Amino acid sequence: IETVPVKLKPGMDGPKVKQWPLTEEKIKALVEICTEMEKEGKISKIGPENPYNTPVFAIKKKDSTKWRKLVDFRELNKRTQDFWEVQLGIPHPAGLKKKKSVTVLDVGDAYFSVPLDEDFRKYTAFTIPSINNETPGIRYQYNVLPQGWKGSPAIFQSSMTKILEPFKKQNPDIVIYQYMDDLYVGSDLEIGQHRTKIEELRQHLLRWYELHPDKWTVQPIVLPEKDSWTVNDIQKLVGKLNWASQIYPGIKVRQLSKLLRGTKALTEVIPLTEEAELELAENREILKEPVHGVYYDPSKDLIAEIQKQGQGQWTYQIYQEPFKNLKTGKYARMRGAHTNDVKQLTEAVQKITTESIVIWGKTPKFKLPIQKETWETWWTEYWQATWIPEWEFVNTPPLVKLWYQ
Amino acid sequence: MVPISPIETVPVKLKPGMDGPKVKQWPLTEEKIKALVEICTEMEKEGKISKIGPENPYNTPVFAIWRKLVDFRELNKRTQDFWGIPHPAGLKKKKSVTVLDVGDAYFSVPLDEDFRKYTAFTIPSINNETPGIRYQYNVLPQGWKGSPAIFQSSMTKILEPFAAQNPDIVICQYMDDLYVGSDLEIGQHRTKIEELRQHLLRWGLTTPKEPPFLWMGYELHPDKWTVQPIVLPEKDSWTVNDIQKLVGKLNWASQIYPGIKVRQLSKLLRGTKALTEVIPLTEEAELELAENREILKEPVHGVYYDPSKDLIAEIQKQGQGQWTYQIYQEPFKNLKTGKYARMRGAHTNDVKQLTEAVQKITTESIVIWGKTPKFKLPIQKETWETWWTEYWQATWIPEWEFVNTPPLVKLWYQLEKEPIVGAETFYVDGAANRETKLGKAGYVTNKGRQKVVPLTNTTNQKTELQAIYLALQDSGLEVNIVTDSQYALGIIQAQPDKSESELVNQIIEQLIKKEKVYLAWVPAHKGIGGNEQVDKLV
Ligand SMILES: N#C/C=C/c1cc(Cl)cc(Oc2ccccc2OCCn2ccc(=O)[nH]c2=O)c1
């Protein structure tokens, strides 16, 4: 009801970012949606005196055929002043990742009840593009708080606290977190009781995605168990072990390499000696321990690397410094994605980003095994998430691909 | 007098840290001065300008060429910041089309009043024996940074309600012009044009050729479109500027004329920058440009877009990294054409380039028609299947069909997933001395077969490839090759069918001749048997 003053970081101007081409259906959906939003005073048309622009497109969330408006606020978010509040930099609720079940909700409906600082509005300017540049694009600017901006939940923190105050005191065993347009709620309860509690909470919101963190995996490095070992088998083994030696200190491959001595056919069976079996055993014991001195630094960037394993399976690693991994994971999930690589990759990036949000309270920077142009062309078609991660592109094939499989 | 509706101005500030421009007035001649006096007098009588006093320290220089010329360059630097052409192929065919270009455009739109103080200029009097005459703009000046944006915004604002009230017509707004079109009968159409220009007259916008239209380097006929004639310069000395101009022109011509090749000409511009240089041409380039003039011999036209019919794109490989495409709806009638030149790589394959082309065409399509076309591609479904399923990168192509029009895109070799039984195992290695550039490369196998070749003028990577090449040459149709080189494996895993390294190309050819190849990697120096660092290091 009252606008809290908001500015940018010193020495930075408003974002000027090119609007990318949009399909006809998305343009129409954006036109209708923005007309409705204009009538509700959520946005207002602007003139040429406002050089600033931020990209916008349209999506479809889960189990819904109704279009949603998605603004890409990344440049504005980084150009937005680092937001510190009377919250005193709230530490991440690390009891959230330890919970049995976590439900994600979209609270973005609330942000439209709060007016935005008048001086800052010029930075929220966007453009609905027209086909073949036949007419100038329609330009609006936000009046209320826009979804996707990092300043929106920061400003709405107080309101959200006052709204969720009864629910939190009622059942303290339910954890609540807020990131962007989304609200994460953890519980140890039963899925039915969980869903009923969620209905209770959303109706508690009205008057004013089901995950499983406990079922999430931290993947250990494993070596094969065989009765007979071919030259090729032992060679791959030596490869993986030599690789892992970059991570685990005590790994030694010498007695295993001692078996390969001479020139033998790749498919020839080589029996293991006692020293060799002993070495492999010691290596196994070494691999069963966690990694030495692995910590999470909030002042450092989170990197996520994804490798395509084929047959619908993908592997990933979230880390900060190389060879020290904060998390590793595997995604085999099949829903309607069988014939499309980019759709799979997109949903995988979404999953990983979500997990990262739950664990560290922030999104990572992905390194994608895809060409820039392909990704840039197709990624918005399959994107159901309200936030967006940063990304880069690795065009050189990793040799470590089969070492995570 | 019928009162004209007020055009609400656009609030305009300057850049922070900078004040208004102050520049001396250049000495003119007497005729220029008189002409400017007359012009400014009648303009003041029209209400487009007003006289000012000493209270305005800001002065913008002026000249006369009569027509007045005001130089806003400094003001253009100190004025604030303000917010692609439509493609004919995207235009949807209409029965009638009218072009209206508003005359005295900028002067019909008022200027922000508080900003008017900055537009001041001075006419020097005769022999500077009197204070120079002083004027300022009450409207949008010709040559101002903020004029076009404000003008088009105002124009849009005015045009909006007429459109909603007349949904049965379509209006395009470009810069200073409006293009209206409809399927209505010419009488009703003409009538609605009159209603429109009247509607514009209410806000005080004065409006006035006929098909074909010469517009933005195009020609628009009622049922078809094309490009304005391309001037091809002919000389015995071809300069760099000539190559830039010719590349631009040919590119411009290639949106419609199929088969244009700019590669040979674009190669001549690498690291030049010298505006006059005489550069000879290769025979490939000469036959290329001869075939270019051959393509430009008998002109062809593009058609317009029909939303009901499907949108189809067909791609052909032109060779040498060149690709060509045609976007159409019905056979032999093209909406538009184009080309794709490969990005600058080290190694590459046809499938990748084809993918890149598909993406390009997709983006261009989404721009022009607002949708992705169905593709016809010179590649088998099985080929694409194997490729994308076994490719380490994620890749996708939208809906497409296979058209058989050689050369087809194929996979030239496929590495095995698992070691081959009964196939000889070649353990290869190579190394060089970084001082004397002397090295060795060779292999040892399980059948006792061995080779070591000494080499001059080489490097570790080169020898590491060389060894693999030797293994390929001396082995049967099925082979297992073991290597310690992450470099070679890095190249071969990228699956190039062509490279700018002759060594790599030879390797590729050898791979093509093979029935089954299994390439395996092992860590170097770790004492893996069969991997001999000693043979090559002597
Ligand atoms: N000078 C000049 C004119 C340029 C010009 C520029 C644009 Cl963006 C559109 C235009 O014509 C149209 C206006 C409104 C709707 C469709 C149109 O075109 C549809 C296709 N078409 C083209 C020419 C013709 O005579 N008939 C015809 O059907 C004309």
mmCIF file with all atom_site columns, C-alpha atoms in Angstrom, chain B residues 39-193:
data_model
loop_
_atom_site.group_PDB
_atom_site.id
_atom_site.type_symbol
_atom_site.label_atom_id
_atom_site.label_alt_id
_atom_site.label_comp_id
_atom_site.label_asym_id
_atom_site.label_entity_id
_atom_site.label_seq_id
_atom_site.pdbx_PDB_ins_code
_atom_site.Cartn_x
_atom_site.Cartn_y
_atom_site.Cartn_z
_atom_site.occupancy
_atom_site.B_iso_or_equiv
_atom_site.pdbx_formal_charge
_atom_site.auth_seq_id
_atom_site.auth_comp_id
_atom_site.auth_asym_id
_atom_site.auth_atom_id
_atom_site.pdbx_PDB_model_num
ATOM 1   C CA . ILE B 1 39  ? 12.612  31.176  -44.335 1.00 0.00 ? 39  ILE B CA 1
ATOM 2   C CA . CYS B 1 40  ? 12.620  31.793  -40.581 1.00 0.00 ? 40  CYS B CA 1
ATOM 3   C CA . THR B 1 41  ? 10.199  34.679  -41.078 1.00 0.00 ? 41  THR B CA 1
ATOM 4   C CA . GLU B 1 42  ? 7.582   32.617  -42.912 1.00 0.00 ? 42  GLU B CA 1
ATOM 5   C CA . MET B 1 43  ? 8.180   29.663  -40.576 1.00 0.00 ? 43  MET B CA 1
ATOM 6   C CA . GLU B 1 44  ? 7.532   31.941  -37.607 1.00 0.00 ? 44  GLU B CA 1
ATOM 7   C CA . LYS B 1 45  ? 4.360   32.998  -39.402 1.00 0.00 ? 45  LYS B CA 1
ATOM 8   C CA . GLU B 1 46  ? 3.455   29.298  -39.610 1.00 0.00 ? 46  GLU B CA 1
ATOM 9   C CA . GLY B 1 47  ? 4.003   28.816  -35.871 1.00 0.00 ? 47  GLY B CA 1
ATOM 10  C CA . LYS B 1 48  ? 6.778   26.227  -36.080 1.00 0.00 ? 48  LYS B CA 1
ATOM 11  C CA . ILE B 1 49  ? 9.338   28.511  -34.404 1.00 0.00 ? 49  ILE B CA 1
ATOM 12  C CA . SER B 1 50  ? 9.553   31.503  -32.048 1.00 0.00 ? 50  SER B CA 1
ATOM 13  C CA . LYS B 1 51  ? 12.062  34.305  -31.395 1.00 0.00 ? 51  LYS B CA 1
ATOM 14  C CA . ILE B 1 52  ? 14.024  34.416  -28.127 1.00 0.00 ? 52  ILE B CA 1
ATOM 15  C CA . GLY B 1 53  ? 16.201  36.775  -26.087 1.00 0.00 ? 53  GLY B CA 1
ATOM 16  C CA . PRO B 1 54  ? 19.636  36.895  -24.348 1.00 0.00 ? 54  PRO B CA 1
ATOM 17  C CA . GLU B 1 55  ? 18.267  34.674  -21.552 1.00 0.00 ? 55  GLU B CA 1
ATOM 18  C CA . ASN B 1 56  ? 19.151  31.604  -23.621 1.00 0.00 ? 56  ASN B CA 1
ATOM 19  C CA . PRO B 1 57  ? 22.956  31.085  -23.539 1.00 0.00 ? 57  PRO B CA 1
ATOM 20  C CA . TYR B 1 58  ? 22.586  27.894  -25.597 1.00 0.00 ? 58  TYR B CA 1
ATOM 21  C CA . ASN B 1 59  ? 23.382  28.287  -29.300 1.00 0.00 ? 59  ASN B CA 1
ATOM 22  C CA . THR B 1 60  ? 23.229  25.692  -32.082 1.00 0.00 ? 60  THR B CA 1
ATOM 23  C CA . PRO B 1 61  ? 25.096  26.489  -35.344 1.00 0.00 ? 61  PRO B CA 1
ATOM 24  C CA . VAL B 1 62  ? 23.242  26.888  -38.649 1.00 0.00 ? 62  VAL B CA 1
ATOM 25  C CA . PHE B 1 63  ? 23.844  26.890  -42.411 1.00 0.00 ? 63  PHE B CA 1
ATOM 26  C CA . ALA B 1 64  ? 21.948  27.188  -45.687 1.00 0.00 ? 64  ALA B CA 1
ATOM 27  C CA . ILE B 1 65  ? 22.125  24.936  -48.755 1.00 0.00 ? 65  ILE B CA 1
ATOM 28  C CA . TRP B 1 66  ? 17.257  27.634  -50.468 1.00 0.00 ? 66  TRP B CA 1
ATOM 29  C CA . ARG B 1 67  ? 16.900  25.119  -47.644 1.00 0.00 ? 67  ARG B CA 1
ATOM 30  C CA . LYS B 1 68  ? 17.849  25.684  -44.007 1.00 0.00 ? 68  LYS B CA 1
ATOM 31  C CA . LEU B 1 69  ? 20.312  23.264  -42.420 1.00 0.00 ? 69  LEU B CA 1
ATOM 32  C CA . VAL B 1 70  ? 20.585  23.063  -38.634 1.00 0.00 ? 70  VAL B CA 1
ATOM 33  C CA . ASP B 1 71  ? 23.406  21.028  -37.095 1.00 0.00 ? 71  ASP B CA 1
ATOM 34  C CA . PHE B 1 72  ? 22.321  19.305  -33.873 1.00 0.00 ? 72  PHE B CA 1
ATOM 35  C CA . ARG B 1 73  ? 25.466  17.145  -33.624 1.00 0.00 ? 73  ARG B CA 1
ATOM 36  C CA . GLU B 1 74  ? 26.595  18.537  -30.274 1.00 0.00 ? 74  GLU B CA 1
ATOM 37  C CA . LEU B 1 75  ? 22.989  18.573  -28.997 1.00 0.00 ? 75  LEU B CA 1
ATOM 38  C CA . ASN B 1 76  ? 22.721  15.050  -30.427 1.00 0.00 ? 76  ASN B CA 1
ATOM 39  C CA . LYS B 1 77  ? 25.612  14.171  -28.148 1.00 0.00 ? 77  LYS B CA 1
ATOM 40  C CA . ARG B 1 78  ? 24.013  15.948  -25.168 1.00 0.00 ? 78  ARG B CA 1
ATOM 41  C CA . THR B 1 79  ? 20.401  14.835  -25.736 1.00 0.00 ? 79  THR B CA 1
ATOM 42  C CA . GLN B 1 80  ? 19.104  11.775  -23.835 1.00 0.00 ? 80  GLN B CA 1
ATOM 43  C CA . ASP B 1 81  ? 18.528  8.269   -25.217 1.00 0.00 ? 81  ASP B CA 1
ATOM 44  C CA . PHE B 1 82  ? 15.319  7.122   -26.927 1.00 0.00 ? 82  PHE B CA 1
ATOM 45  C CA . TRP B 1 83  ? 13.785  3.744   -27.733 1.00 0.00 ? 83  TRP B CA 1
ATOM 46  C CA . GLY B 1 84  ? 14.893  -3.954  -39.098 1.00 0.00 ? 84  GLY B CA 1
ATOM 47  C CA . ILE B 1 85  ? 12.644  -3.497  -42.121 1.00 0.00 ? 85  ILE B CA 1
ATOM 48  C CA . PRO B 1 86  ? 9.474   -5.518  -42.802 1.00 0.00 ? 86  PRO B CA 1
ATOM 49  C CA . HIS B 1 87  ? 10.049  -8.315  -45.297 1.00 0.00 ? 87  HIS B CA 1
ATOM 50  C CA . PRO B 1 88  ? 7.808   -8.436  -48.412 1.00 0.00 ? 88  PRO B CA 1
ATOM 51  C CA . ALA B 1 89  ? 7.486   -12.228 -48.232 1.00 0.00 ? 89  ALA B CA 1
ATOM 52  C CA . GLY B 1 90  ? 5.794   -11.860 -44.849 1.00 0.00 ? 90  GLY B CA 1
ATOM 53  C CA . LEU B 1 91  ? 3.158   -9.498  -46.213 1.00 0.00 ? 91  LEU B CA 1
ATOM 54  C CA . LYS B 1 92  ? -0.232  -11.147 -46.704 1.00 0.00 ? 92  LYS B CA 1
ATOM 55  C CA . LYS B 1 93  ? -1.829  -10.590 -50.117 1.00 0.00 ? 93  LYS B CA 1
ATOM 56  C CA . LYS B 1 94  ? -4.639  -8.020  -50.158 1.00 0.00 ? 94  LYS B CA 1
ATOM 57  C CA . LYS B 1 95  ? -6.921  -6.824  -52.967 1.00 0.00 ? 95  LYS B CA 1
ATOM 58  C CA . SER B 1 96  ? -6.141  -3.122  -52.509 1.00 0.00 ? 96  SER B CA 1
ATOM 59  C CA . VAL B 1 97  ? -3.120  -1.334  -51.014 1.00 0.00 ? 97  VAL B CA 1
ATOM 60  C CA . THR B 1 98  ? -2.656  2.415   -50.485 1.00 0.00 ? 98  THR B CA 1
ATOM 61  C CA . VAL B 1 99  ? 0.540   4.243   -49.533 1.00 0.00 ? 99  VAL B CA 1
ATOM 62  C CA . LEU B 1 100 ? 0.270   7.484   -47.571 1.00 0.00 ? 100 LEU B CA 1
ATOM 63  C CA . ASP B 1 101 ? 3.399   9.429   -46.632 1.00 0.00 ? 101 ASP B CA 1
ATOM 64  C CA . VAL B 1 102 ? 2.641   12.319  -44.278 1.00 0.00 ? 102 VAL B CA 1
ATOM 65  C CA . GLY B 1 103 ? 4.134   15.562  -45.567 1.00 0.00 ? 103 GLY B CA 1
ATOM 66  C CA . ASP B 1 104 ? 5.851   18.033  -43.247 1.00 0.00 ? 104 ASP B CA 1
ATOM 67  C CA . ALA B 1 105 ? 6.018   15.150  -40.772 1.00 0.00 ? 105 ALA B CA 1
ATOM 68  C CA . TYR B 1 106 ? 8.130   16.296  -37.815 1.00 0.00 ? 106 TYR B CA 1
ATOM 69  C CA . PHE B 1 107 ? 6.824   19.870  -37.921 1.00 0.00 ? 107 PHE B CA 1
ATOM 70  C CA . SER B 1 108 ? 3.255   18.662  -37.384 1.00 0.00 ? 108 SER B CA 1
ATOM 71  C CA . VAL B 1 109 ? 4.212   17.356  -33.939 1.00 0.00 ? 109 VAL B CA 1
ATOM 72  C CA . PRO B 1 110 ? 4.794   19.805  -31.041 1.00 0.00 ? 110 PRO B CA 1
ATOM 73  C CA . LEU B 1 111 ? 7.944   19.653  -28.914 1.00 0.00 ? 111 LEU B CA 1
ATOM 74  C CA . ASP B 1 112 ? 8.278   19.399  -25.130 1.00 0.00 ? 112 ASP B CA 1
ATOM 75  C CA . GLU B 1 113 ? 7.933   23.017  -24.067 1.00 0.00 ? 113 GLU B CA 1
ATOM 76  C CA . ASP B 1 114 ? 10.553  22.962  -21.331 1.00 0.00 ? 114 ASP B CA 1
ATOM 77  C CA . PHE B 1 115 ? 12.953  21.365  -23.811 1.00 0.00 ? 115 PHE B CA 1
ATOM 78  C CA . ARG B 1 116 ? 12.427  24.081  -26.439 1.00 0.00 ? 116 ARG B CA 1
ATOM 79  C CA . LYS B 1 117 ? 15.055  26.309  -24.812 1.00 0.00 ? 117 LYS B CA 1
ATOM 80  C CA . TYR B 1 118 ? 17.806  23.948  -25.966 1.00 0.00 ? 118 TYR B CA 1
ATOM 81  C CA . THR B 1 119 ? 16.909  24.098  -29.666 1.00 0.00 ? 119 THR B CA 1
ATOM 82  C CA . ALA B 1 120 ? 17.930  27.750  -30.047 1.00 0.00 ? 120 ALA B CA 1
ATOM 83  C CA . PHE B 1 121 ? 19.989  28.912  -33.042 1.00 0.00 ? 121 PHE B CA 1
ATOM 84  C CA . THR B 1 122 ? 21.415  32.173  -34.420 1.00 0.00 ? 122 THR B CA 1
ATOM 85  C CA . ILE B 1 123 ? 21.285  33.826  -37.839 1.00 0.00 ? 123 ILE B CA 1
ATOM 86  C CA . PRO B 1 124 ? 24.275  36.142  -38.272 1.00 0.00 ? 124 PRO B CA 1
ATOM 87  C CA . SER B 1 125 ? 23.305  39.652  -39.373 1.00 0.00 ? 125 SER B CA 1
ATOM 88  C CA . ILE B 1 126 ? 25.063  41.533  -42.173 1.00 0.00 ? 126 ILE B CA 1
ATOM 89  C CA . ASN B 1 127 ? 28.742  42.246  -41.423 1.00 0.00 ? 127 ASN B CA 1
ATOM 90  C CA . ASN B 1 128 ? 28.058  41.352  -37.767 1.00 0.00 ? 128 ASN B CA 1
ATOM 91  C CA . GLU B 1 129 ? 27.203  44.995  -37.030 1.00 0.00 ? 129 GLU B CA 1
ATOM 92  C CA . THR B 1 130 ? 23.956  43.952  -35.361 1.00 0.00 ? 130 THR B CA 1
ATOM 93  C CA . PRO B 1 131 ? 22.994  41.278  -32.805 1.00 0.00 ? 131 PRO B CA 1
ATOM 94  C CA . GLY B 1 132 ? 22.333  37.994  -34.601 1.00 0.00 ? 132 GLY B CA 1
ATOM 95  C CA . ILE B 1 133 ? 18.684  37.029  -34.989 1.00 0.00 ? 133 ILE B CA 1
ATOM 96  C CA . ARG B 1 134 ? 17.549  34.402  -32.489 1.00 0.00 ? 134 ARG B CA 1
ATOM 97  C CA . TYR B 1 135 ? 15.054  31.566  -32.954 1.00 0.00 ? 135 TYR B CA 1
ATOM 98  C CA . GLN B 1 136 ? 13.915  28.360  -31.242 1.00 0.00 ? 136 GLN B CA 1
ATOM 99  C CA . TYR B 1 137 ? 11.814  25.358  -32.292 1.00 0.00 ? 137 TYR B CA 1
ATOM 100 C CA . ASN B 1 138 ? 8.219   24.825  -31.172 1.00 0.00 ? 138 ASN B CA 1
ATOM 101 C CA . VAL B 1 139 ? 8.067   21.468  -32.979 1.00 0.00 ? 139 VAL B CA 1
ATOM 102 C CA . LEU B 1 140 ? 10.236  18.443  -33.826 1.00 0.00 ? 140 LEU B CA 1
ATOM 103 C CA . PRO B 1 141 ? 13.362  19.607  -35.708 1.00 0.00 ? 141 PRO B CA 1
ATOM 104 C CA . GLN B 1 142 ? 14.660  17.780  -38.780 1.00 0.00 ? 142 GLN B CA 1
ATOM 105 C CA . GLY B 1 143 ? 17.906  16.107  -37.733 1.00 0.00 ? 143 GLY B CA 1
ATOM 106 C CA . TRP B 1 144 ? 17.176  15.827  -34.009 1.00 0.00 ? 144 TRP B CA 1
ATOM 107 C CA . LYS B 1 145 ? 18.009  12.582  -32.193 1.00 0.00 ? 145 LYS B CA 1
ATOM 108 C CA . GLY B 1 146 ? 14.569  12.325  -30.597 1.00 0.00 ? 146 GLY B CA 1
ATOM 109 C CA . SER B 1 147 ? 12.385  13.294  -33.559 1.00 0.00 ? 147 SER B CA 1
ATOM 110 C CA . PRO B 1 148 ? 11.673  9.903   -35.215 1.00 0.00 ? 148 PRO B CA 1
ATOM 111 C CA . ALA B 1 149 ? 10.770  8.069   -31.986 1.00 0.00 ? 149 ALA B CA 1
ATOM 112 C CA . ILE B 1 150 ? 8.434   10.790  -30.706 1.00 0.00 ? 150 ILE B CA 1
ATOM 113 C CA . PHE B 1 151 ? 6.879   11.149  -34.150 1.00 0.00 ? 151 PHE B CA 1
ATOM 114 C CA . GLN B 1 152 ? 6.156   7.434   -34.543 1.00 0.00 ? 152 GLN B CA 1
ATOM 115 C CA . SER B 1 153 ? 4.848   7.200   -30.974 1.00 0.00 ? 153 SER B CA 1
ATOM 116 C CA . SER B 1 154 ? 2.439   10.083  -31.567 1.00 0.00 ? 154 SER B CA 1
ATOM 117 C CA . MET B 1 155 ? 1.404   8.598   -34.915 1.00 0.00 ? 155 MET B CA 1
ATOM 118 C CA . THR B 1 156 ? 0.723   5.237   -33.259 1.00 0.00 ? 156 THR B CA 1
ATOM 119 C CA . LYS B 1 157 ? -1.302  6.905   -30.503 1.00 0.00 ? 157 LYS B CA 1
ATOM 120 C CA . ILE B 1 158 ? -3.454  8.660   -33.096 1.00 0.00 ? 158 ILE B CA 1
ATOM 121 C CA . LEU B 1 159 ? -3.804  5.593   -35.338 1.00 0.00 ? 159 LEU B CA 1
ATOM 122 C CA . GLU B 1 160 ? -4.880  3.136   -32.618 1.00 0.00 ? 160 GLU B CA 1
ATOM 123 C CA . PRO B 1 161 ? -8.644  3.866   -32.393 1.00 0.00 ? 161 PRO B CA 1
ATOM 124 C CA . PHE B 1 162 ? -9.191  3.928   -36.181 1.00 0.00 ? 162 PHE B CA 1
ATOM 125 C CA . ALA B 1 163 ? -7.782  0.403   -36.386 1.00 0.00 ? 163 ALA B CA 1
ATOM 126 C CA . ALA B 1 164 ? -10.071 -1.088  -33.734 1.00 0.00 ? 164 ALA B CA 1
ATOM 127 C CA . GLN B 1 165 ? -13.070 0.576   -35.378 1.00 0.00 ? 165 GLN B CA 1
ATOM 128 C CA . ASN B 1 166 ? -12.014 -0.779  -38.777 1.00 0.00 ? 166 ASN B CA 1
ATOM 129 C CA . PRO B 1 167 ? -10.927 -4.393  -38.136 1.00 0.00 ? 167 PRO B CA 1
ATOM 130 C CA . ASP B 1 168 ? -11.666 -5.281  -41.763 1.00 0.00 ? 168 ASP B CA 1
ATOM 131 C CA . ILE B 1 169 ? -8.609  -3.326  -42.896 1.00 0.00 ? 169 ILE B CA 1
ATOM 132 C CA . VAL B 1 170 ? -4.935  -3.776  -42.015 1.00 0.00 ? 170 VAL B CA 1
ATOM 133 C CA . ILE B 1 171 ? -2.553  -0.882  -41.408 1.00 0.00 ? 171 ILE B CA 1
ATOM 134 C CA . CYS B 1 172 ? 1.239   -1.009  -41.371 1.00 0.00 ? 172 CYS B CA 1
ATOM 135 C CA . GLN B 1 173 ? 3.236   1.836   -39.843 1.00 0.00 ? 173 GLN B CA 1
ATOM 136 C CA . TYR B 1 174 ? 6.908   2.040   -40.754 1.00 0.00 ? 174 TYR B CA 1
ATOM 137 C CA . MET B 1 175 ? 8.604   5.411   -40.294 1.00 0.00 ? 175 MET B CA 1
ATOM 138 C CA . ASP B 1 176 ? 7.148   8.487   -41.976 1.00 0.00 ? 176 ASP B CA 1
ATOM 139 C CA . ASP B 1 177 ? 4.769   6.363   -44.036 1.00 0.00 ? 177 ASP B CA 1
ATOM 140 C CA . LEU B 1 178 ? 1.574   4.372   -43.559 1.00 0.00 ? 178 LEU B CA 1
ATOM 141 C CA . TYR B 1 179 ? 0.552   1.437   -45.734 1.00 0.00 ? 179 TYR B CA 1
ATOM 142 C CA . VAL B 1 180 ? -3.107  0.450   -45.630 1.00 0.00 ? 180 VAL B CA 1
ATOM 143 C CA . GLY B 1 181 ? -4.614  -2.611  -47.255 1.00 0.00 ? 181 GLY B CA 1
ATOM 144 C CA . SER B 1 182 ? -7.869  -4.509  -47.528 1.00 0.00 ? 182 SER B CA 1
ATOM 145 C CA . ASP B 1 183 ? -9.843  -7.142  -49.414 1.00 0.00 ? 183 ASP B CA 1
ATOM 146 C CA . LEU B 1 184 ? -12.708 -4.651  -49.682 1.00 0.00 ? 184 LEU B CA 1
ATOM 147 C CA . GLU B 1 185 ? -13.891 -3.402  -53.073 1.00 0.00 ? 185 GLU B CA 1
ATOM 148 C CA . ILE B 1 186 ? -11.876 -0.470  -54.438 1.00 0.00 ? 186 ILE B CA 1
ATOM 149 C CA . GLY B 1 187 ? -14.769 1.910   -53.743 1.00 0.00 ? 187 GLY B CA 1
ATOM 150 C CA . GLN B 1 188 ? -15.114 0.986   -50.075 1.00 0.00 ? 188 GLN B CA 1
ATOM 151 C CA . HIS B 1 189 ? -11.326 0.895   -49.798 1.00 0.00 ? 189 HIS B CA 1
ATOM 152 C CA . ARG B 1 190 ? -10.947 4.391   -51.268 1.00 0.00 ? 190 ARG B CA 1
ATOM 153 C CA . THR B 1 191 ? -13.710 5.596   -48.951 1.00 0.00 ? 191 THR B CA 1
ATOM 154 C CA . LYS B 1 192 ? -11.973 4.189   -45.873 1.00 0.00 ? 192 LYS B CA 1
ATOM 155 C CA . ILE B 1 193 ? -8.718  5.768   -47.031 1.00 0.00 ? 193 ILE B CA 1
#
